[PDB]
Ligand binder design. Structure first.
Ligand SMILES: CC(C)(C)C[C@@H]1N[C@@H](C(=O)Nc2ccc(C(N)=O)cc2)[C@H](c2cccc(Cl)c2F)[C@]12C(=O)Nc1cc(Cl)ccc12
Length: 85
């Protein structure tokens, strides 16, 4: 029931992926980032479950060359870096 507010940088990525508003449930943020990841071809299905983002804006906001989509605690933390409230 908590609505979070992406920073301007993260918000721009979400909107490029099709997001329409300025605040979101965490589930919505994860959904739009999933769409962003697929749009930028950072993830290949049925391989190692790795997001490869070293050359993408996402890599900087998160701070990585890659991460596993199974590392959910880490992903929540990397998203949290990019929230206002
Ligand atoms: C990269 C794809 C697959 C397009 C989306 C990812 N699929 C979700 C996922 O967990 N995929 C997955 C795929 C395959 C297997 C397997 N074969 O064992 C296990 C897990 C993952 C996720 C869901 C819910 C909470 C979190 Cl924190 C999360 F990271 C997932 C998601 O739903 N959104 C999201 C956003 C970021 Cl930044 C990063 C990641 C996502």
């Amino acid at each position: 029931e908590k609505l979070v507010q992406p920073t301007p940088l993260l918000l721009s990525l979400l909107k490029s992926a099709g997001a329409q508003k300025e605040t979101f449930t965490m589930k919505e943020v994860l959904y739009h980032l999933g769409q962003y990841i697929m749009a930028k071809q950072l993830y290949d299905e049925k391989q190692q479950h790795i997001v490869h983002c070293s050359n993408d804006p996402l890599g900087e906001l998160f701070g990585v060359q890659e991460f596993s989509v199974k590392e959910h605690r880490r992903i929540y933390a990397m998203i949290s870096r990019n929230l206002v409230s």
